[PDB]
Short mmCIF file of C-alpha atoms (C1' of nucleotides) in Angstrom, two decimals:
data_model
loop_
_atom_site.label_atom_id
_atom_site.label_comp_id
_atom_site.label_asym_id
_atom_site.label_seq_id
_atom_site.Cartn_x
_atom_site.Cartn_y
_atom_site.Cartn_z
CA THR F 1 -13.54 -1.11 -23.62
CA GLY F 2 -13.10 -1.23 -19.71
CA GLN F 3 -15.27 1.55 -19.40
CA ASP F 4 -18.20 -0.22 -17.14
CA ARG F 5 -16.82 0.79 -13.76
CA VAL F 6 -15.55 3.78 -12.17
CA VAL F 7 -12.92 3.57 -9.86
CA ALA F 8 -10.78 5.19 -7.27
CA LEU F 9 -7.57 4.92 -5.67
CA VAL F 10 -6.92 7.34 -2.69
CA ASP F 11 -3.76 7.65 -1.19
CA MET F 12 -2.79 9.73 1.69
CA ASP F 13 0.52 12.25 1.07
CA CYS F 14 3.26 11.12 3.08
CA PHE F 15 0.73 9.81 5.77
CA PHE F 16 3.13 9.51 8.79
CA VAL F 17 4.19 12.88 8.44
CA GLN F 18 0.80 14.38 8.38
CA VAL F 19 -0.11 12.45 11.34
CA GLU F 20 3.10 14.18 13.14
CA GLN F 21 2.33 17.16 11.75
CA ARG F 22 -1.28 17.39 12.89
CA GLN F 23 -0.42 16.69 16.42
CA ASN F 24 2.99 18.81 16.23
CA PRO F 25 2.27 22.45 14.43
CA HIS F 26 5.82 23.22 14.36
CA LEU F 27 6.11 20.27 11.68
CA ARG F 28 3.83 21.66 9.44
CA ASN F 29 5.26 23.14 5.82
CA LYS F 30 8.69 22.31 6.86
CA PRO F 31 10.92 19.58 5.53
CA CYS F 32 9.84 16.82 7.49
CA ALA F 33 10.62 13.11 8.02
CA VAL F 34 9.73 10.40 10.30
CA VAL F 35 12.32 7.77 11.54
CA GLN F 36 12.46 4.78 13.41
CA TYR F 37 15.21 3.38 15.64
CA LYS F 38 17.24 6.15 15.82
CA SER F 39 20.39 4.59 17.32
CA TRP F 40 21.81 3.83 14.08
CA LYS F 41 22.62 5.80 11.74
CA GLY F 42 19.90 8.31 12.73
CA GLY F 43 17.05 5.81 12.36
CA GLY F 44 15.66 4.88 8.97
CA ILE F 45 13.15 7.39 7.31
CA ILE F 46 9.93 5.77 6.43
CA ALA F 47 8.16 9.02 5.51
CA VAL F 48 9.40 12.26 3.71
CA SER F 49 7.43 15.71 3.07
CA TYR F 50 7.40 17.44 0.05
CA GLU F 51 9.26 20.04 1.45
CA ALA F 52 12.26 17.66 2.06
CA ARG F 53 11.72 15.35 -1.20
CA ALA F 54 12.85 18.47 -2.90
CA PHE F 55 16.08 18.48 -1.23
CA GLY F 56 16.35 14.56 -2.35
CA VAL F 57 15.33 13.01 1.22
CA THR F 58 13.36 9.68 -0.02
CA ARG F 59 12.22 6.76 2.19
CA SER F 60 14.42 4.05 3.43
CA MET F 61 17.35 6.26 3.59
CA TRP F 62 19.32 6.59 6.80
CA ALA F 63 18.44 9.74 8.84
CA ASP F 64 22.27 11.11 9.44
CA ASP F 65 22.51 10.74 5.51
CA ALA F 66 19.36 12.58 5.11
CA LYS F 67 20.87 15.70 7.14
CA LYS F 68 23.43 15.91 4.86
CA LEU F 69 20.99 16.38 1.77
CA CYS F 70 18.87 18.36 3.92
CA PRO F 71 20.44 20.66 7.01
CA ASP F 72 16.78 22.03 8.18
CA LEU F 73 15.15 18.53 8.36
CA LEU F 74 12.91 18.01 11.44
CA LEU F 75 12.67 14.51 12.71
CA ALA F 76 9.56 12.79 14.27
CA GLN F 77 10.29 9.70 15.93
CA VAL F 78 7.98 6.26 15.74
CA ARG F 79 6.55 5.83 19.34
CA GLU F 80 8.55 2.91 20.75
CA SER F 81 6.91 -0.38 22.92
CA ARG F 82 8.35 -3.29 24.23
CA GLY F 83 11.57 -2.88 22.31
CA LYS F 84 10.05 -2.25 18.74
CA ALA F 85 8.30 0.15 16.80
CA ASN F 86 4.65 1.04 17.47
CA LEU F 87 2.63 2.12 14.63
CA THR F 88 -0.97 2.30 16.86
CA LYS F 89 -1.11 6.27 16.23
CA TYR F 90 -0.70 5.72 12.33
CA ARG F 91 -3.28 2.52 12.55
CA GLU F 92 -5.53 4.76 14.24
CA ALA F 93 -5.47 7.82 12.05
CA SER F 94 -5.79 5.38 9.32
CA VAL F 95 -9.55 4.12 10.77
CA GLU F 96 -10.45 7.74 11.35
CA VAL F 97 -10.53 8.19 6.91
CA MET F 98 -11.60 5.09 6.04
CA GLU F 99 -14.78 5.63 7.99
CA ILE F 100 -15.01 9.08 6.24
CA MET F 101 -14.44 7.57 3.02
CA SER F 102 -17.06 4.68 3.64
CA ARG F 103 -19.78 7.09 3.67
CA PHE F 104 -19.27 7.98 0.30
CA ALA F 105 -18.75 4.65 -1.31
CA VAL F 106 -17.80 1.12 -1.24
CA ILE F 107 -13.91 0.97 0.13
CA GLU F 108 -10.87 -1.50 -0.30
CA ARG F 109 -8.21 -0.83 2.35
CA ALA F 110 -4.98 -1.40 0.36
CA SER F 111 -2.61 -0.69 3.03
CA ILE F 112 -2.24 1.85 6.22
CA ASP F 113 -2.42 5.13 3.60
CA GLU F 114 -4.40 3.98 0.80
CA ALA F 115 -7.60 2.61 -0.09
CA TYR F 116 -9.73 1.80 -3.50
CA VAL F 117 -12.93 3.04 -4.15
CA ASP F 118 -15.82 1.69 -6.31
CA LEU F 119 -18.18 4.57 -7.22
CA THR F 120 -20.21 2.79 -10.02
CA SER F 121 -23.15 2.90 -8.07
CA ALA F 122 -22.69 6.39 -6.20
CA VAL F 123 -22.26 7.92 -9.75
CA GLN F 124 -25.43 6.40 -11.14
CA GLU F 125 -27.27 7.95 -8.14
CA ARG F 126 -25.89 11.36 -8.88
CA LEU F 127 -26.72 11.32 -12.63
CA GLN F 128 -30.41 10.87 -11.66
CA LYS F 129 -30.55 13.71 -9.46
CA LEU F 130 -28.11 15.82 -11.59
CA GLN F 131 -30.32 14.99 -14.72
CA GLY F 132 -29.88 17.86 -17.16
CA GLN F 133 -27.38 20.06 -14.91
CA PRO F 134 -23.99 21.24 -16.29
CA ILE F 135 -21.02 20.41 -14.87
CA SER F 136 -19.29 23.29 -13.24
CA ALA F 137 -15.40 23.72 -13.01
CA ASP F 138 -16.32 24.67 -9.82
CA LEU F 139 -17.15 21.32 -8.82
CA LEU F 140 -13.64 20.16 -9.74
CA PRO F 141 -11.11 22.66 -8.08
CA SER F 142 -8.43 20.21 -7.55
CA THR F 143 -9.01 18.27 -10.95
CA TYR F 144 -6.14 17.32 -13.74
CA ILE F 145 -7.30 15.70 -16.74
CA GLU F 146 -4.79 13.95 -18.23
CA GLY F 147 -3.59 14.30 -22.08
CA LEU F 148 -5.36 18.05 -21.81
CA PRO F 149 -4.78 20.56 -22.76
CA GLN F 150 -4.24 19.73 -26.44
CA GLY F 151 -3.58 21.99 -29.48
CA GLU F 152 0.71 32.89 -21.00
CA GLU F 153 -1.71 31.44 -18.58
CA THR F 154 -0.36 28.03 -19.39
CA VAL F 155 2.95 28.60 -18.82
CA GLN F 156 1.99 28.37 -14.77
CA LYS F 157 0.54 24.78 -13.68
CA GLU F 158 -2.65 26.28 -12.39
CA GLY F 159 -3.07 27.48 -15.67
CA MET F 160 -2.72 24.30 -17.37
CA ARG F 161 -4.98 22.43 -15.22
CA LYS F 162 -7.80 24.85 -15.54
CA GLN F 163 -7.52 24.86 -19.59
CA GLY F 164 -7.51 21.08 -19.85
CA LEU F 165 -10.50 20.81 -17.31
CA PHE F 166 -12.22 23.73 -19.28
CA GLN F 167 -11.56 21.60 -22.82
CA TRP F 168 -12.60 18.44 -21.09
CA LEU F 169 -15.87 20.00 -19.91
CA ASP F 170 -16.94 21.66 -23.02
CA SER F 171 -16.50 18.58 -24.76
CA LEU F 172 -18.79 16.56 -22.27
CA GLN F 173 -21.54 19.82 -22.62
CA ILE F 174 -21.63 19.83 -26.58
CA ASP F 175 -22.03 15.90 -26.45
CA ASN F 176 -18.27 15.05 -27.70
CA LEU F 177 -17.37 13.10 -25.20
CA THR F 178 -18.73 9.35 -24.40
CA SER F 179 -21.20 8.38 -21.58
CA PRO F 180 -18.26 6.29 -19.90
CA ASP F 181 -16.36 9.82 -19.78
CA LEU F 182 -19.53 11.63 -18.09
CA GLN F 183 -19.46 8.83 -15.21
CA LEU F 184 -15.57 9.83 -14.79
CA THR F 185 -16.49 13.04 -14.64
CA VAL F 186 -19.12 12.51 -11.84
CA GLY F 187 -16.67 9.97 -10.19
CA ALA F 188 -14.38 13.12 -9.87
CA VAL F 189 -17.07 15.51 -8.30
CA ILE F 190 -17.66 12.85 -5.81
CA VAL F 191 -14.06 12.02 -5.09
CA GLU F 192 -13.38 15.92 -4.59
CA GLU F 193 -16.44 16.10 -1.89
CA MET F 194 -14.49 12.89 -0.44
CA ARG F 195 -11.34 14.35 -0.16
CA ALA F 196 -12.92 17.55 1.09
CA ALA F 197 -14.92 15.74 3.95
CA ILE F 198 -11.26 14.19 4.80
CA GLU F 199 -9.44 16.83 5.04
CA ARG F 200 -12.53 18.86 7.21
CA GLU F 201 -12.82 16.18 9.42
CA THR F 202 -9.26 15.01 9.92
CA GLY F 203 -6.79 18.00 8.86
CA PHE F 204 -5.28 15.10 6.19
CA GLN F 205 -4.54 15.94 2.65
CA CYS F 206 -4.53 13.16 -0.04
CA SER F 207 -4.12 12.54 -3.55
CA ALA F 208 -6.24 10.41 -5.90
CA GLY F 209 -6.79 9.04 -9.16
CA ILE F 210 -10.16 8.10 -11.14
CA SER F 211 -10.44 6.03 -13.78
CA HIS F 212 -12.23 2.55 -14.89
CA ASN F 213 -9.94 -0.18 -13.12
CA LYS F 214 -7.31 0.12 -10.01
CA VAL F 215 -4.57 -0.04 -12.20
CA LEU F 216 -5.38 2.77 -13.94
CA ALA F 217 -6.60 4.54 -10.98
CA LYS F 218 -3.38 3.98 -9.03
CA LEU F 219 -1.50 5.03 -12.07
CA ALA F 220 -3.82 8.27 -12.38
CA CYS F 221 -3.08 9.10 -8.49
CA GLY F 222 0.48 9.44 -8.98
CA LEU F 223 0.51 12.09 -11.90
CA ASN F 224 -0.42 15.02 -9.63
CA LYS F 225 1.13 15.38 -6.27
CA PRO F 226 0.54 16.43 -3.29
CA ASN F 227 -3.10 17.29 -2.66
CA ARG F 228 -4.52 16.94 -6.40
CA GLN F 229 -6.81 14.40 -8.43
CA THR F 230 -6.18 12.94 -11.51
CA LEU F 231 -8.67 11.52 -14.25
CA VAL F 232 -7.33 8.96 -16.62
CA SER F 233 -9.89 8.33 -19.30
CA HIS F 234 -9.97 5.38 -21.80
CA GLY F 235 -9.23 7.48 -24.61
CA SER F 236 -5.96 9.06 -22.84
CA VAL F 237 -4.27 5.51 -22.34
CA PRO F 238 -2.65 5.36 -25.79
CA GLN F 239 -0.74 8.52 -25.28
CA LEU F 240 -0.11 7.66 -21.75
CA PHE F 241 1.28 4.43 -22.29
CA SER F 242 3.24 5.05 -25.15
CA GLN F 243 6.22 6.75 -22.88
CA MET F 244 5.13 4.90 -20.05
CA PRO F 245 7.90 2.65 -18.29
CA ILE F 246 6.60 -0.89 -17.90
CA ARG F 247 7.76 -0.85 -14.30
CA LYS F 248 5.52 1.76 -13.12
CA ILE F 249 2.57 -0.31 -13.95
CA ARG F 250 0.88 -2.13 -10.80
CA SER F 251 2.17 -5.48 -10.46
CA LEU F 252 4.89 -5.10 -12.89
CA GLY F 253 7.75 -3.34 -10.43
CA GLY F 254 9.26 -6.37 -9.65
CA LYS F 255 10.52 -9.89 -11.38
CA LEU F 256 7.74 -10.25 -14.01
CA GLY F 257 7.91 -6.52 -15.39
CA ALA F 258 11.63 -7.20 -15.51
CA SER F 259 11.18 -10.35 -17.25
CA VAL F 260 8.57 -8.89 -19.66
CA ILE F 261 11.11 -6.27 -20.59
CA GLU F 262 13.80 -8.68 -20.99
CA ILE F 263 11.81 -11.39 -22.71
CA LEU F 264 9.98 -9.10 -24.95
CA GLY F 265 12.93 -6.40 -25.72
CA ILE F 266 10.57 -3.56 -24.65
CA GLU F 267 10.47 -0.80 -22.20
CA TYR F 268 7.05 1.14 -22.45
CA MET F 269 3.66 -0.05 -21.71
CA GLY F 270 2.22 0.52 -24.96
CA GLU F 271 4.74 -1.90 -27.17
CA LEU F 272 2.86 -4.40 -25.37
CA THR F 273 -0.01 -3.89 -27.87
CA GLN F 274 1.54 -5.45 -30.59
CA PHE F 275 1.89 -8.91 -29.34
CA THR F 276 -1.07 -11.64 -29.64
CA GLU F 277 -2.73 -13.04 -26.19
CA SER F 278 -1.40 -16.29 -27.12
CA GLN F 279 2.28 -14.93 -27.58
CA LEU F 280 2.05 -13.13 -24.14
CA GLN F 281 0.61 -16.54 -22.47
CA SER F 282 3.64 -18.81 -23.82
CA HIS F 283 6.04 -16.47 -22.42
CA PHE F 284 4.48 -15.39 -19.28
CA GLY F 285 1.54 -17.95 -18.41
CA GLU F 286 -2.28 -17.96 -18.83
CA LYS F 287 -3.16 -15.80 -16.29
CA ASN F 288 -0.12 -13.07 -16.86
CA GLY F 289 -0.57 -13.17 -20.38
CA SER F 290 -4.40 -12.29 -20.53
CA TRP F 291 -3.75 -10.02 -18.01
CA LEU F 292 -0.55 -8.19 -19.85
CA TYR F 293 -2.80 -8.27 -23.20
CA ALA F 294 -6.03 -6.74 -21.40
CA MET F 295 -4.03 -4.31 -19.44
CA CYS F 296 -1.97 -2.40 -22.23
CA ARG F 297 -5.25 -1.61 -23.65
CA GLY F 298 -6.14 0.19 -20.60
CA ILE F 299 -8.40 -3.11 -19.59
CA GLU F 300 -8.26 -4.43 -15.91
CA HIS F 301 -10.89 -6.51 -13.99
CA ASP F 302 -9.78 -6.85 -10.59
CA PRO F 303 -12.68 -5.94 -8.46
CA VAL F 304 -12.80 -3.28 -5.58
CA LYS F 305 -13.22 -5.87 -2.50
CA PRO F 306 -15.57 -4.34 0.00
CA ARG F 307 -12.80 -4.84 2.83
CA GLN F 308 -12.12 -2.09 5.37
CA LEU F 309 -10.45 -4.49 7.66
CA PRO F 310 -7.17 -6.65 7.56
CA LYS F 311 -7.53 -10.05 6.82
CA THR F 312 -4.20 -11.03 9.24
CA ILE F 313 -2.65 -8.75 12.04
CA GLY F 314 1.02 -9.22 12.93
CA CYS F 315 4.23 -7.67 14.16
CA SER F 316 7.87 -8.21 13.30
CA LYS F 317 11.20 -7.18 14.38
CA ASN F 318 14.45 -7.61 12.62
CA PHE F 319 17.76 -8.51 13.96
CA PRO F 320 20.26 -7.39 11.55
CA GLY F 321 24.10 -8.30 11.86
CA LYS F 322 25.63 -8.35 15.17
CA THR F 323 22.11 -7.92 16.95
CA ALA F 324 20.92 -11.53 15.62
CA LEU F 325 19.31 -13.54 18.44
CA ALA F 326 21.70 -16.40 19.55
CA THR F 327 20.56 -17.85 22.83
CA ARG F 328 17.05 -19.29 23.96
CA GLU F 329 16.30 -16.89 26.18
CA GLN F 330 16.67 -14.17 23.82
CA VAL F 331 14.26 -15.90 21.69
CA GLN F 332 11.59 -16.68 24.08
CA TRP F 333 11.65 -12.90 25.54
CA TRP F 334 11.30 -11.28 21.92
CA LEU F 335 8.67 -14.07 21.14
CA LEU F 336 7.04 -12.80 24.34
CA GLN F 337 7.26 -8.85 23.15
CA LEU F 338 5.77 -9.63 20.09
CA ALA F 339 3.38 -11.83 21.49
CA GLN F 340 2.34 -8.51 23.83
CA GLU F 341 1.87 -6.36 21.00
CA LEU F 342 -0.06 -8.89 19.30
CA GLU F 343 -2.51 -9.58 22.16
CA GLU F 344 -3.28 -5.87 22.77
CA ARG F 345 -3.81 -5.35 18.81
CA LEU F 346 -6.06 -8.68 18.88
CA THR F 347 -8.15 -7.76 21.81
CA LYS F 348 -8.98 -4.15 19.86
CA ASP F 349 -9.93 -5.93 16.95
CA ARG F 350 -12.33 -8.18 18.87
CA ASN F 351 -14.12 -5.64 21.01
CA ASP F 352 -14.10 -3.11 17.87
CA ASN F 353 -14.83 -5.49 14.68
CA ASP F 354 -16.67 -8.73 16.44
CA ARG F 355 -14.35 -11.37 14.75
CA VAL F 356 -11.52 -13.56 16.69
CA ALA F 357 -8.38 -14.79 15.19
CA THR F 358 -8.15 -18.43 14.84
CA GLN F 359 -4.55 -19.44 13.58
CA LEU F 360 -1.01 -18.26 14.90
CA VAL F 361 1.56 -17.89 12.07
CA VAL F 362 5.22 -17.58 12.94
CA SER F 363 7.67 -16.92 10.86
CA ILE F 364 11.95 -16.47 11.17
CA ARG F 365 14.60 -15.56 9.05
CA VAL F 366 18.02 -17.28 9.53
CA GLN F 367 21.49 -15.44 9.50
CA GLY F 368 23.02 -16.45 5.81
CA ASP F 369 19.72 -16.53 4.15
CA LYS F 370 18.41 -13.54 1.76
CA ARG F 371 14.98 -14.22 1.75
CA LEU F 372 12.30 -12.24 3.27
CA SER F 373 11.01 -15.40 5.67
CA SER F 374 13.68 -18.45 5.73
CA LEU F 375 10.87 -20.44 7.68
CA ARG F 376 7.25 -20.28 8.64
CA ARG F 377 5.06 -22.60 10.60
CA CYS F 378 1.40 -22.24 11.96
CA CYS F 379 -0.32 -23.46 15.23
CA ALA F 380 -4.12 -22.94 16.74
CA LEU F 381 -4.79 -19.67 18.25
CA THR F 382 -7.47 -20.73 21.03
CA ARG F 383 -6.63 -17.79 23.60
CA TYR F 384 -5.92 -14.06 23.22
CA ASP F 385 -3.00 -14.70 25.73
CA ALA F 386 0.64 -13.66 25.17
CA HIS F 387 2.24 -15.78 27.33
CA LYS F 388 0.23 -18.59 25.96
CA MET F 389 1.00 -17.54 22.24
CA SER F 390 4.54 -16.75 22.51
CA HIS F 391 5.27 -19.93 24.35
CA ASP F 392 3.34 -21.94 21.66
CA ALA F 393 5.33 -19.97 19.00
CA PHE F 394 8.33 -21.16 20.56
CA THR F 395 7.30 -24.71 20.55
CA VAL F 396 6.51 -24.73 16.63
CA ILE F 397 10.06 -23.33 15.60
CA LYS F 398 12.21 -24.68 18.58
CA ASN F 399 13.07 -27.43 16.44
CA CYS F 400 15.04 -25.02 13.65
CA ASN F 401 17.66 -24.36 15.94
CA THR F 402 20.80 -26.68 14.92
CA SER F 403 22.42 -25.86 18.44
CA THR F 404 21.09 -22.84 25.79
CA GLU F 405 22.39 -21.41 22.79
CA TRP F 406 20.69 -20.92 19.55
CA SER F 407 22.08 -21.33 16.21
CA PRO F 408 22.14 -20.14 13.13
CA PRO F 409 21.17 -16.76 14.97
CA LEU F 410 17.95 -15.39 14.15
CA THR F 411 17.70 -12.38 12.05
CA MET F 412 14.15 -11.95 12.15
CA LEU F 413 11.18 -12.91 13.99
CA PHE F 414 7.40 -12.59 12.90
CA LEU F 415 4.05 -13.29 14.75
CA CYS F 416 1.07 -13.43 12.65
CA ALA F 417 -2.83 -14.21 13.40
CA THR F 418 -4.92 -15.11 10.44
CA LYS F 419 -7.98 -16.86 10.01
CA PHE F 420 -10.48 -14.31 11.73
CA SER F 421 -14.40 -15.97 12.49
CA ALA F 422 -17.51 -13.83 12.97
CA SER F 423 -18.31 -13.50 16.90
"C1'" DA Y 1 22.07 -2.45 8.98
"C1'" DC Y 2 17.28 0.32 4.53
"C1'" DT Y 3 12.34 -2.04 9.09
"C1'" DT Y 4 7.71 -3.25 9.77
"C1'" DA Y 5 3.29 -5.03 7.91
"C1'" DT Y 6 -0.47 -7.11 3.93
"C1'" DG Y 7 -2.35 -9.23 0.23
"C1'" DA Y 8 -2.14 -12.69 -3.10
"C1'" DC Y 9 -0.28 -17.06 -6.11
"C1'" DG Y 10 1.56 -21.43 -7.22
"C1'" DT Y 11 1.83 -26.13 -5.66
"C1'" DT O 1 0.98 -26.35 4.12
"C1'" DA O 2 4.58 -23.61 3.10
"C1'" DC O 3 4.60 -23.33 2.94
"C1'" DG O 4 7.05 -20.82 -0.18
"C1'" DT O 5 7.48 -16.48 -3.21
"C1'" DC O 6 6.42 -12.36 -5.29
"C1'" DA O 7 4.54 -7.51 -4.90
"C1'" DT O 8 4.20 -3.01 -2.16
"C1'" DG O 9 3.54 0.91 1.23
#
DNA sequence: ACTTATGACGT
DNA sequence: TACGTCATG
């Protein structure tokens, strides 16, 4: 029934904003955003506080337009180094959180602000120590139970939260709830503690989803935000999916989800239940069909990968429109700038994480191409040397220039290090 | 003129 | 390999 595992998805609420708010107290509890590259239209927003979201301010919005929506908005700019955005501060804060999470359970870093947590073993241990012990509501002070309450206090959201938690707990206590339900509940108690440790030790608040797999846990995470956690049980899946737009499910937010909607003639996740697996496999392929068939039933098997460390390290800069690189010197100079930041990051990785990158991947985008990458070429990464890496990167891609000039001018340079080896 | 990074799959 | 494409933060 896909109830074997307990899995959490933890997400740092507007993480870059929190990092800035911790460092500059004046920014706390105010409509706030983090921007990069202020010159063009105030710069683009990459993180927005909840106070600012109320005004309709979103990420990937220009700061000048954001100010139109929210006149009182406070802006924090990303550190700029070597002519590009420098995210070191956020990566460092990110590592702080992952270390704390690591003490409680097995974690998979999903991005800079999120991680999956496999709590199956952790739950098993707690159960033995806590045998025969009722689970107080006091253990779950920020937990919402999806689908509850069912059946004056309720007008307030905290009123709703309490009643749902009480019905849920009373039903476990009674013996009405299944064994996987108890596992999730203990998982949630563990996550409350993990979240309390994170805030105490970093000052950072975060939301979490708790469920039996990654898709459900990620879904649950978004249900009650910010600074709250949501338990989605197997039993809640039918009602939850019944009105749940397909594009909301992890991995269905793009072309596949669109074609599932377009080919099937449906809009909600639960509608997928009417199709046989073979029907779904014939439309979308063996793997996707199988995965769809199981997912609409709340079943998903992707494991939480024990991996706190990124598999690749990289940096990129965009040169949109008129700023597109059109000279040899410009291309070399920017490759150098990128290779310089890469070196610093690689060396830090080497001393901290006891591994070295062995392959250098160069990606570029040319003017007139919509695709994220127009071209990708690799070469050996023998020495963590910015001048060598930059020069090697040039060698592999120089043949791309059709015709001291460069054309078609590049709208993108990307350097990425891959294939890490223990040492 | 939404920028900057990652992880994973198909071939 | 792109080595290239998809999906997401």
